[PDB]
From a paper:
Na+–K+–Cl− cotransporters functions as an anion importers, regulating trans-epithelial chloride secretion, cell volume, and renal salt reabsorption. Loop diuretics, including furosemide, bumetanide, and torsemide, antagonize both NKCC1 and NKCC2, and are first-line medicines for the treatment of edema and hypertension. Here we determined three cryo-EM structures of phosphorylated NKCC1 individually bound with furosemide, torsemide, and bumetanide, unlocking two modes of interaction of loop diuretics with NKCC1. In all the three co-structures, NKCC1 assembled as a C2-symmetric dimer in which two TMDs are separated by ~30 Å within the lipid bilayer and two cytosolic C-terminal domains (CTDs) interdigitate and associate extensively with the TMDs from beneath.
Torsemide lacks the carboxyl group which is indispensable for furosemide and bumetanide to co-occlude a K+ ion and contributes to their K+-dependent antagonism on NKCCs. Our NKCC1/torsemide co-structure showed that torsemide adopts a U-shape configuration with its sulfonylpyridine group, which marks the U-turn, facing TM1b and TM6a on one side and the propan-2-ylurea and methylanilino groups projecting toward TM3 and TM8 on the other side (D and EV3C). Torsemide notably reaches slightly deeper into the NKCC1 ion translocation path than do furosemide and bumetanide, and in doing so, it completely occupies and expels ions from the Cl− site 1 and K+ site. Just beneath the extracellular ion entryway, torsemide’s propan-2-ylurea group forms salt bridge with the main chain nitrogen atom of Val302 in TM1a and also engages with Gly301, Val302, and Met303 in TM1a and Met382 in TM3 via hydrophobic interactions. At the U-turn, torsemide’s sulfonylpyridine group establishes hydrophobic interactions with Ala497 and Pro496 in the TM6b. Further toward the midway of NKCC1 ion translocation path, torsemide’s methylanilino group projects toward a hydrophobic pocket and interacts with Tyr383 in TM3, and Ile677 and Ser678 in TM8. Our MD results showed that the favored (i.e., more stable) state of torsemide is the one that features a protonated and positively charged pyridine (Tor_NH_N, Fig. EV4E–G). In this state, torsemide’s pyridine can replace the K+ ion in its binding site, while its deprotonated and negatively charged sulfonylurea can substitute the Cl− ion at the so-called site 1. On the other hand, torsemide encroaches into and expels the K+ ion from its binding site, suggesting that it could be more potent under low [K+] conditions. Another intriguing finding regarding loop diuretic pharmacology is that the sulfamoyl group of furosemide and bumetanide directly engages with extracellular gate residues of NKCC1, but torsemide’s sulfamoyl group reaches further toward the midway point of the ion translocation path and makes no obvious contact with NKCC1.
Residue numbers in the entry:
A (entry chain A), B (entry chain B): 217 to 250, 282 to 926, 1022 to 1212
Write the structure that this text describes.
């Protein structure tokens, strides 16, 4: 049947080849008459879980649960979890749209809402990961240094030992990462097993209370300790929000699995479930460990065997005394340790202490490895789009699975430098702010997509309410402020600067962002609003349709039309295409884009309006009948003077004059512009009341900065002995309209016979098109029907001598008075259709406008365009 | 010449008679073939000066100067003058645009920025003036009560005497106001003369030092007092902002002259200059009096001759002794005189004593008279505007000059009630905030008019910078908050409530406000923005041109098309008008308004688009070639099934089919809707790949609240023995597009001969259109060019039997399967142009769709409309 059935091969044209077996027929033919890929578990779940988990489970979780209450600590965890889950829901929604080629969160953000935000967030996120690797390596070095300092071993000052260990660790991590994407997965699995072993060791040792640890804070699940550990016992210059700020970074790292989207077996399924499961499991483990530590250890303790453990005569109505006096009465002296003074509680409540030490080692190393892997991927994805041209390179992949070795080396260098600094406690909040900004950008991506009701939003993952996403972005910003407000300001400024730079760069890319859909929707909504507004005389605007063909053919005329339309009124540059329909469609499709881009590149607020018809008359008919939307429709027809009418087929001149006639018939106002295309005052000779357009146009000219210094001087026609009366009337009328005029000149020389020379010149010019009916018999009635109506009938030439003499005399007056004007505006002669031939009308116009400064012959609708009523 | 020269009579038609000869010729006729008025001084200057001056020049200015030094008091006056001068500049700008028919600031505000704000501000301002009448009368009563209590002539308490005196004065003022406008002006002049006499008396007395007043603070213009008082004191619980709030109401009252616009000889010349002169003179007098009082009286004093006045040896480091010791050394014991404890200081520092009291009487009475005059004016103007229908009563005018007698009575009643309350100290801030809100609305009117760039702005008064006006409105809001913050919140709430009520009432009025111009400018700017956005498959929208004629003939089809276009994509209702051009233009002009209003009233976000042409074919050509603006152009022709084609001239059917053909030639998509107009699943039978529109339309259908429950079930064609493979392929394709489907059905019964009965029925239906070439001879070729291309040839009928049987069998299948669907979407058969006659195409469509639920035959553009990439 030649009509192809729906087939995936038809739509598959970017990630594969359709081939000969799949090719949808075009409408014309029917019409025209004749590599490593990971699963969701090992690719998203494990990476997300390992990135989320860190030293908080073994260092600060006990301190947080002590400073705050069990209930308040659980609340802090839950609120951080809200912020991360909302972010994860938004990420899954943005990832279940189409095929994600690679990159990571940068790819999702860019393909969602445009290269500007995409590049800003991509650079920020890549830098954040490149510095996070160094921070995690520094944490590992700190843990190793503390472990060796607890013994006698040491090489150099603590800082230098930290630097050495960090450098060795970073070198090893870079080697492992360069080894490949499978070795890294094996190492991640090993580290996860070790960390789970450490967690289980802590939980097992919390169930075995050894008396030797009694002088410590550990007691072994005593309900009295639990009841005493509620409430916010803040023993410092800190508060609830300080604890929240300290803990929240422990909820981050939820985008690790989506950072390697270019290596997943199948995104759109692995990312959502993997990320959500990782968030759930990590939050559950955090809550469990918080409660466990809060039900075993007392806040304060003075570890000492000599400490009274016999519970002699006393009351000391605290939780500790409820079972024994061990680690009691340090409310005045700074007792050694406890749930609020020792950060190794997890290492003591546990069993095998080196098991917990290895758990911390794995927690830091897994995060470092994940960051080192993820940052180069984002950088290479952002570089492959050439958003920052200098960053070209750092995008070449090596081996079967394209791996950014150059990005790997760059991340290694950045991490090594930041480790060489070795003092990173002041930079962590900036990195946290960067991550929070990325989360907020993802949430805003989802919200923007839901706001712009693009039919192609079509996300495969539900449970992504737009309002929840907006609330999540707001919460991300608020949490960003809650910790290191000045860091938040710095990140905001950096993001805004990058966004502005990218917007000004205007990169050559087009992805289908929600920004374009929202632009269309905004235009549609505003047009629909405007369609319900009644038109008023004082709200009239010149809405011009300029017949120019190619808008670049005559630039002076286009600029002039722009002057009195730019920012006030509509401007449609109409172009008529002629020839066969087939090639005409392709030519119009090319020209539309070419000329719209040309206009936008020259600051012309005009609309290109191509049209295909047999002749210019029919195309202009199309435009004057249909061009426009609702109330934004042309009311004025603008033409340029047919400067070549003298040497041109009379059919073209007839078409020009017929354009005039159809413009008048359709109740349009006609503006004919005659100026020298090759490349003071404004004189307005408006002698017939067209409704005011002749005055409105030059006033709008004066409203612009190009004609601000030009003063309007008016010319009118009067009767001798009555000059002053008419001048006063014109001055009063102009004052009522509030149009400033430098001078008013009343001329009685109109209606007088022009000179003999000018009449002779007009006759000589008009001779070739004269019919000369008198010199011929009735046979001439065939020329008037075949070689006509171009021919000028002697009857009309004698019946309209007044108008011809008026045109010649008016040209004389214009030359004598307005020769020094910057622009002339004059009433456009109107010829009744059927009474005057096209050739005679063209000759009238040519005689009127010949050899003068830029001139505009204006004939308005005759509907009132000005008013003096408020 | 029948062309009329410019003349004021053509444009003078709304506020004056046009006349016989005052009628410009219409473009068709030339182209078609064939009592008491006041001047600016007595009307604006005097009223503004008398309203601005209150009891602050004799009661509170001295206390203010005492509380804050000379410099700080001068600063307060200057800042209040900034707020008022900005307001006055905006008022002059808004009043020098057109002829101000009547009313006051209400008329200017309404004619500037729309009936909503106009009515809100008018009601609030009228109420403010009415209440101010009572407040000024209460001030007069208080002054008289104090004067008579100084001599113990009070009767029936004090408040109960204030009530009686105020009632008598209000009755007298009402009588004077009813007496006419000239008598009020004479009384105003008399009061002004008295007040100037009082001011001059104070200034003269300040130069006549008298030892009698030595016990009082007055000393005689001594420098030492000036240096002492040049600095702030701010005694008691007083602050700079508190004194500024106390003083600022003194600067108000600048709109008294503009409130009399309906009785001025020449507004646009009297209001601006008069108001500015009033502001200047009042501020100058205020500054002079403040400085003079600060240079002649000490802040503290104790008036007694027995007190120490010798100035003998005494340390008294304070500067009060610089000239004498009279009225000194009460820094601990409260004093009874001075610039901080006595308010009658002016009366004491003057010459004749009762003349100051007379000046106070005049100041308090002139403001009351002005308010009682102005409030009815504004109320009558806003009532003649008929913005609140219940208030149409208070619009009648009496006498030669329309005088709102009912408004006068209502204002008198309101003032009498508020005087009967007699305790207005708590209501003054409300009135001040109302006045400030009016000032802010005037400034925002000027700013909004400058924002929208309508050519009709054209204000005759310069010096009105838009940013200055916006700053003035902001300052007015801030000042109104500064004093009585809760009063400011209450006034804001009242203004917003009135604005919402007026917006929802939708009054039937059109004045060409700045809001409409801004709507147009916003739409144009958004369209210009959208014109620069590149096109992407992800952002494709269905932009439909529905050929419906009158948009109310078939409501069901319009609803159906609007369901999948509202909020997503454009919708243009195209109507073609035939007949003579002259009458056609008027018909289209009326129809455009009628149908746009009908659409907006019916909640259709569509655009009515009428064209004039001699046949539907070329009108649709106009629409498909030119309709739209920039990137908001249609790409899908929507047609209703010709249900009468069986009984209708075959020229109409040929035009319909050629509409199809031209739609395809212009590479448009085509949607044909067949549904019953007189009186839950969506079945998509898309069998040919059109690019995806057949699938994209029903999805958008399911995207709306009216089709949320319906589930999409798909039907495709397949080969027997491989049904499951094709079903899996279709399921995968739909999942990649993210279009939810309840079921997929693969049909092998296509391309099979339908029932004999159905073929016989099709033949019977098609019988009276066959060319019967075999039965006839070569002469039949004439019918192919005279009765054709309607006639169905025998060659085509025999050569396209497969397609006809396909249509019949497809209708059988749809009746068998989709008979219970809420809507059906099917692939529209495409007939090669020149190969199939129009009648056979129509019969194909009829056979395909009949005895079915609502159906959409969709033939997409064959360009990809869906994508599974991101
Ligand atoms: C890079 C960076 C910057 C700022 C804060 C964090 N913290 C995070 C982040 C994600 N998951 C857990 C944590 S954590 O709870 O602090 N555990 C942890 O081992 N942090 C190490 C840096 C010592 C990480
Ligand atoms: C109706 C009203 C409400 C609130 C404040 C004012 N004050 C104004 C207004 C205009 N010019 C001067 C003043 S004034 O300086 O306060 N003098 C004065 O006599 N006010 C009298 C009410 C006693 C007026
Ligand atoms: Cl992350
Ligand atoms: Cl006022
Ligand atoms: Na980790
Ligand atoms: Na007054």
């Amino acid at each position: 049947t030649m009509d192809a059935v729906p087939r995936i091969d038809h739509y598959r044209h970017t990630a594969a080849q359709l081939g000969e077996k799949l090719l949808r027929p075009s409408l014309a033919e029917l019409h025209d008459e004749l590599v490593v890929k990971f699963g969701w578990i090992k690719g998203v779940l494990v990476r997300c879980m390992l990135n989320i988990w860190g030293v908080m489970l073994f260092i600060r979780l006990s301190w947080i649960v002590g400073q705050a209450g069990i209930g308040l600590s659980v609340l802090v965890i839950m609120m951080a979890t809200v912020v991360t889950t909302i972010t994860g829901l938004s990420t899954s929604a943005i990832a279940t749209n189409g095929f994600v080629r690679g990159g990571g969160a940068y790819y999702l953000i860019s393909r969602s809402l445009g290269p500007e935000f995409g590049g800003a967030i991509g650079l920020i996120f890549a830098f954040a990961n490149a510095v996070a690797v160094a921070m995690y390596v520094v944490g590992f070095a700190e843990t190793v240094v503390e472990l060796l300092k607890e013994h006698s071993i040491l090489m150099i000052d603590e800082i230098n030992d930290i630097r050495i260990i960090g450098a060795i660790t970073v070198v090893i991590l870079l080697g492992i990462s360069v080894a490949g994407m499978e070795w890294e997965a094996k190492a991640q699995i090993v580290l996860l097993v070790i960390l789970l072993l450490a967690i289980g060791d802590f939980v097992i040792g919390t169930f075995i209370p050894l008396e030797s640890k009694k002088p410590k804070g550990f007691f072994g699940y005593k309900s009295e300790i639990f009841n005493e550990n509620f409430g916010p016992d803040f023993r410092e210059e800190e508060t609830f929000f300080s604890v929240f700020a300290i803990f929240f970074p422990a909820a981050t790292g939820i985008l690790a699995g989506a950072n390697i989207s270019g290596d997943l077996a199948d995104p759109q399924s692995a990312i959502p479930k993997g990320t959500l499961l990782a968030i759930l499991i990590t939050t559950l483990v955090y809550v469990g460990i918080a409660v466990s530590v809060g039900s075993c250890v007392v806040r304060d303790a003075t570890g000492n065997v000599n400490d009274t453990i016999v519970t002699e005569l006393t009351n000391c109505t605290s939780a500790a005394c409820k079972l024994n006096f061990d680690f009691s009465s340090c409310e005045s002296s700074p007792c050694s340790y406890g749930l609020m003074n020792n950060f190794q509680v997890m290492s003591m409540v546990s069993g095998f202490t080196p098991l917990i030490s290895a758990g911390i080692f794995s927690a830091t190393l897994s995060s470092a490895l994940a960051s080192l892997v993820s940052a180069p991927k984002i950088f290479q994805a952002l570089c492959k789009d050439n958003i920052y041209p200098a960053f070209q390179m750092f995008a070449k992949g090596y081996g079967k699975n394209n791996e950014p070795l150059r990005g790997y080396i760059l991340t290694f260098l950045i991490a090594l430098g930041f480790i060489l600094i070795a003092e990173l406690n002041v930079i962590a909040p900036i990195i946290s702010n960067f991550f929070l900004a990325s989360y907020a950008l993802i949430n805003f991506s989802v919200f923007h997509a839901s706001l712009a009701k693009s039919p192609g939003w079509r996300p495969a993952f539900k449970y992504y309410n737009m309002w929840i996403s907006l609330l999540g972005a707001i919460l991300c910003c608020i949490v960003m402020f809650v910790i290191n407000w000045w860091a938040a300001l710095l990140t905001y400024v950096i993001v805004l600067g990058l966004y502005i730079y990218v917007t000004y760069k205007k990169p050559d890319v087009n992805w289908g962002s929600s920004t374009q859909a929202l632009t269309y929707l905004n235009a549609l909504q505003h047009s629909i609003r405007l369609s319900g507004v009644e038109d008023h005389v004082k709200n009239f605007r010149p809405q011009c349709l300029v017949m120019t063909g190619a808008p670049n053919s005559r630039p002076a005329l286009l600029h002039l039309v722009h002057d009195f339309t730019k920012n006030v009124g509509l401007m449609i540059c109409g172009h008529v295409h002629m020839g066969p329909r087939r090639q005409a469609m392709k030519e119009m499709s090319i020209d539309q884009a070419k000329y719209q881009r040309w206009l936008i590149k020259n600051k012309m607020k005009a609309f290109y309006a191509p049209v295909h018809a047999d002749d210019l008359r029919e195309g202009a008919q199309y435009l004057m009948q249909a061009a426009g939307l609702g109330r934004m429709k042309p009311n004025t027809l603008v033409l340029g003077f047919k400067k070549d009418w003298l040497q041109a087929d009379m059919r073209d001149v007839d078409m020009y004059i017929n354009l005039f006639h159809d413009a008048f018939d359709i109740q349009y106002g006609v503006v004919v512009i005659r100026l020298k295309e090759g490349l003071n005052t404004i004189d307005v000779w408006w002698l017939f009341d067209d409704g005011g357009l002749t005055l409105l146009i030059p006033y709008l000219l004066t409203t612009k900065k190009k004609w601000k210094d030009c003063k309007i001087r008016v010319f009118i026609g009067g009767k001798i002995n009555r000059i002053d009366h008419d001048r006063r009337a014109m001055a009063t009328l102009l004052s009522k309209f509030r149009i400033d005029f430098s001078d008013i000149m009343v001329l009685g020389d109109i209606n007088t016979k022009p000179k003999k020379e000018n009449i002779i010149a007009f006759e000589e010019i008009i001779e070739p098109y004269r019919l000369h009916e008198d010199d011929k018999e009735q046979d001439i009635a065939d020329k008037m029907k075949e070689d006509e109506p171009w021919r000028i009938t002697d009857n009309e030439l004698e019946l309209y001598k007044t108008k011809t003499y008026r045109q010649i005399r008016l040209n004389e007056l214009l030359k004598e008075h307005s020769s020094t004007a910057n622009i002339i505006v004059m009433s456009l002669p109107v010829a009744r259709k059927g009474a005057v031939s096209s050739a005679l009308y063209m000759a009238w116009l040519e005689a009127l406008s010949k050899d003068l400064p830029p001139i505009l012959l204006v004939r308005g609708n005759h509907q009132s365009v000005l008013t003096f009523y408020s």
